Amino acid sequence: WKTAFYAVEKRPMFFEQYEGGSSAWCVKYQFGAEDGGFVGCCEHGRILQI
Amino acid sequence: EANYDFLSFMIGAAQRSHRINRNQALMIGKGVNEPKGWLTENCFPVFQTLPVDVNGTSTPAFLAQDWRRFVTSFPAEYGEARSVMHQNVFGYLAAMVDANGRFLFGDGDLTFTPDLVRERIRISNCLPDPTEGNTKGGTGQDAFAAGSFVAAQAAWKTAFYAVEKRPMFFEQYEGGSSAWCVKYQFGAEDGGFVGCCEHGRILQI
Amino acid sequence: AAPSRLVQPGCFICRGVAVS
Amino acid sequence: MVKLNCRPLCQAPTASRLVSPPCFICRGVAPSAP
Amino acid sequence: MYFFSVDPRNGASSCCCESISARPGEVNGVMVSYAAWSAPLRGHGLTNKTTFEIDGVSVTPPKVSNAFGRTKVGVVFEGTLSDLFPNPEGEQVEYEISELNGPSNGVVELGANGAFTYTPGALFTGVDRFWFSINGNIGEYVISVDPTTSELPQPPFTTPVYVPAARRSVDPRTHVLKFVLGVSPAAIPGDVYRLTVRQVAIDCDGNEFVHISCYDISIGSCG
Amino acid sequence: MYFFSVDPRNGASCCCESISARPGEVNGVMVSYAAWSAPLRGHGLTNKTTFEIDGVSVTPPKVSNAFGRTKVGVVFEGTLSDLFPNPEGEQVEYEISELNGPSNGVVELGANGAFTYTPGALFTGVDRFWFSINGNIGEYVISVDPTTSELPQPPFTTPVYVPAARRSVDPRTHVLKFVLGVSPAAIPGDVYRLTVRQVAIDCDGNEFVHISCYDISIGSCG
Amino acid sequence: MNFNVGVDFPSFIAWDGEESFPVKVDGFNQFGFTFKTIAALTAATTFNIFYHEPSDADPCVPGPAIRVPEVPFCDTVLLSEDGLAAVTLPETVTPDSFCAGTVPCMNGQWISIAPATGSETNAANVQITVTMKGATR
Amino acid sequence: MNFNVGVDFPSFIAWDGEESFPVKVDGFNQFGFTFKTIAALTAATTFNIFYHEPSDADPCVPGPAIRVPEVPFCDTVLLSEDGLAAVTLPETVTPDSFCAGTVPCMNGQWISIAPATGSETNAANVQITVTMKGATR
Amino acid sequence: FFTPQVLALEVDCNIECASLLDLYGQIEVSRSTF
Amino acid sequence: HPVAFRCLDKLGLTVQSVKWDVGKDPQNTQVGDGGMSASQRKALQQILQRPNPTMSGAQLRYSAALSWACFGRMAFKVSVMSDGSVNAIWPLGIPFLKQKFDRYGDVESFQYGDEAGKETIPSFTKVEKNDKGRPIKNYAFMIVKPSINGAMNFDVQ
Amino acid sequence: PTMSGAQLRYSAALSWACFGRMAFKVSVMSDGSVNAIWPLGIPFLKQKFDRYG
């Protein structure tokens, strides 16, 4: 697995109050993170099926 | 240009192509233009197992009892001998099962991983394997093509000699190379022969 | 050398009772 | 001098079976009958 | 391997066309040295723009006719051999399948009376021919094995004498032409064909110098 | 390659020289004007040679030539029977000589004096092919135009010709070179005459003319 | 987040299976083809490569079609018997696989592809387009 | 010196004037169109964009034709009525001139272009084609 | 306008086979035909 | 060759016979002595009498003179540890020794080997020098015999 | 650098023997302090005279 599939890390989550749209009667938060991954070369792994 | 250094890739992809080719030649090289390999010369005293009657069908087979008689029958007067085989074969012996259902090696471990250098087996998965890669062999019927090769055993330090005369060399082939295009030339000189037909052995089906 | 066989001992168990 | 270069768009899987040695039968049991 | 030094077209040194002897079945090679003609014409040597033509000046049209069949992969093919020998007079038919000119990727067995069966080799698709011999007279039976999908095209019923499609060559360093000449096993001994060659050189700027010669191929048996 | 050393005009069977020719060939000729130009010490020879061809035995052609036109990519079809007026009544075995077929297309000769000419893809120019009716050889020329207007009409190359510009004269060794091509429609036995007028030059810029003749004999198979 | 890759490597159609098209390659400096079939082929297909020149009547319209010469590097051993560059799409190409290629030396202002004689009925099942590189002007 | 750019930004056909062709954008991660006209147009020409899914039966043949929605880009005003992507080649665009559009965020695995209704008359003179950016195999 | 971060990995997946050249007897030689 | 080999080994033998030592030079106008530490001079004395292991100074002298007579060239290799103190000295095979030049006028590095051997040993010209000038990493010498038309390093042997 | 006084004397006398000439070059810093000397290849050396002598 150290060379069969890769995981890509860029940035963890954040949290900040959305100012526009949050009046003095409502309030709206906003969050998100960014990451991904891929498969290096699927010649290093097997699957056992029935 | 072309940031990825190509020349270093080619010299690396030339010693590699040789390394597998010399290994392939010394095994099954056919006479002219390639050293006579010990697998094709066929001087080694060759032993073939007997079939088993699966409900009166007599299919070819190879059971653990055969492998013990093949390694212990080696005359200890020749010296210490090592056995070479394909990794599917060693996996084949590791998966044997007796009539009651248990395993013969490692009576319950989910795996059999013994000390190989203490058993003189030297797995090299380019020798021909009787499992046709995999997905063949070990059946009730419709597998185990009779007459195949499984493994060998010999005092290799004296049963087969390797000859080296002038190994790999690279040089810019001056002539045919102009001020805008280079032509490289590489080469090597080696060979091999068998030492004593009476020191090895081969197991068949 | 000609291919020689490797006949090994089979299931040898009994010496005093034949089966029916 | 054109030298082509081709790749496949949808690679295909590759299945295969995993035949394993059968339970032992032995070449003749001593106490037996014809 | 024949070798002809062609005339140099300098106004100096029975039939005019040279002779070439061939035996039915053989496939030989011929060399032609245009050095004496193209070396004074200082240019870029010869070019691969040669053309060949085969004309017959004596044929003696064949007695038996050929036949073409169709079949798919793996399926056995059956056929007869009696409707291929138009005999003006009455005589027995000694059917024979020559062992030398048999099929290439299959196998046939000759029946007792104009029968044969072509069972193609397993996992094989293409075209396969074999040469029968009806009472000394020789013909061919061409069968194409289709990969069961749709159909195959028609082969051209190879001629008695032919030059292969693309096996010619030329070396501009020594001004030599090399080509292959193959004769069918059905060529009748005693006949004569004519082969013409058009070789074109080239000057330094890309123009052309044409040159035509001829050769008499007399198909003679036993060497 | 032919070679002729010309007489230097020093007062020291026929007069014109002999040249053999074969229908279809394109050969080269050399003339060594050294004997006549070297004593006239000047600036050597000049590229002002002039040729002329006459026929002293013609045997006029039986079959007439013909010309057509078509746009690029468009297939062209025509007839081949109205070009051979036959005096007697007999059969006609039309044939397209493979050695002199088209160069940028293909022709499908039907059974009876009919053909269709498919030009090569994306080709604009002229193309020729030499048919043969009852052994009589004649050329058929087809011009593929680039769909805009037209291309000019080629001059129906003669039985024996000298190309437009392939001649060269070396003033350092006084040798003239040229090309002599014989059409595939030439008739064996015929004789033509090639007259050559070569001009030298003095140190000041005056001329020294020199005239010679040659007899071309169209012979078969060498 | 995909970009407008159109500008900065644009592409045009060079052979739609029925008629060719001349493509201008003056404004760019590097280019190549991307072959692609639509149906299973029957035999090896060969295409000819042509280059144009700006016409005397108008410098914004291609003139006649000349054939690009052939340039060998070192490894060439075929030489295609004519000294005229040409591509040859090999048999056994499933119609979900593209093939790439280009000439080593451009000449003129335009480039065009056309099916060679003999393989004019199989070229109706293939598609050939051209993509260039950074613009000089 | 020109590089063989058929790999590393290949190109395929999407509308040859008579038929749309779904192009696979799975193996790549960026793509765009490069419009091109062949003759003077009559009026504004509008094209629809469609994205496909892997078919239920065969996993690398395109399924049905679903229309990709359109998203704003922080300053949009037009806001095409039925929230669906569309490209409008403006009138008075001469030949020998190409533009380039690209749908901002991708969905599906096959993308396609088709002439919108009421504009398929003068749509036979344009030829859209696609070029991807970067293999991710 | 957007330059990708060129990472420093290079995948391969290309088994040789396995070495079997150290068991055999080794003898360095001279001009051929010993 | 009999006579050629005889003259060569005589020439190598006689040169190999002399005994080395470092010493104060006669033309010592440089009162600012270049005996930087007086310990590197001791180590240099060590290395001239005991070179790289499995080789003595005599064999170094023999190989140097032999190669100088055969090709007109002399090359070597040093292993200065970190402070101008040379660690070991190696002679270089001249037949298969290649060098690369700078843009201005001189050689900068030496390549020793075609494919695997690719040690681009820098010249003494450009190398990490100490605060006084003495190098800190390896280098080579490339001693050359002069010839006509100059070309100090570009000329024929 | 890359040349000692012995090699300079050798090159000078050799060119003096073959051609009867000797040429050199100096790199005086700023104050008569000569910094470096180079021997000059005499075969391909060209020189330009003044108007007087």
Author numbering:
A (entry chain g1): 415 to 464
B (entry chain h1): 260 to 464
C (entry chain f1): 10 to 29
D (entry chain e): 1 to 34
E (entry chain O3): 1 to 13, 21 to 230
F (entry chain P3): 1 to 12, 21 to 230
G (entry chain m2), H (entry chain l2): 1 to 137
I (entry chain h1): 174 to 207
Manuscript excerpt for this entry:
We describe cryo-EM structures of the neck, the neck-capsid and neck-tail junctions, and capsid of the Agrobacterium phage Milano. The tail to capsid junction involves a symmetry mismatch that is bridged by the neck, and is therefore crucial for the assembly of tailed phage. The extensive network of disulfide bonds within and between neck, collar, capsid and tail provides an exceptional structural stability to Milano.
Finally, a no-symmetry-imposed map was used to generate an atomic model of the complete neck. We describe how the neck 1 protomers undergo structural polymorphism to connect the 12-fold neck with the 5-fold capsid vertex. The 12 ring-forming gp14 protomers exhibit structural polymorphism. Their β-sandwich domains adopt different orientations in each protomer and can be described as 12 steps in a continuous tilting relative to the α-helical domain. These domains are covalently linked to the MCP (gp9) by two disulfide bonds, gp14Cys117– gp9Cys252 and gp14Cys120– gp9Cys440, which emanate from a head joining loop of the β-sandwich domains. The head joining loops of the remaining seven gp14 protomers are not resolved in our maps and thus likely to be disordered. In summary, in the gp14 neck 1 dodecamer, the α-helical domain connects the portal to neck 1 ring smoothly while maintaining C12 symmetry, while its β-sandwich domain binds to the five-fold symmetric capsid vertex by adopting 12 different conformations.
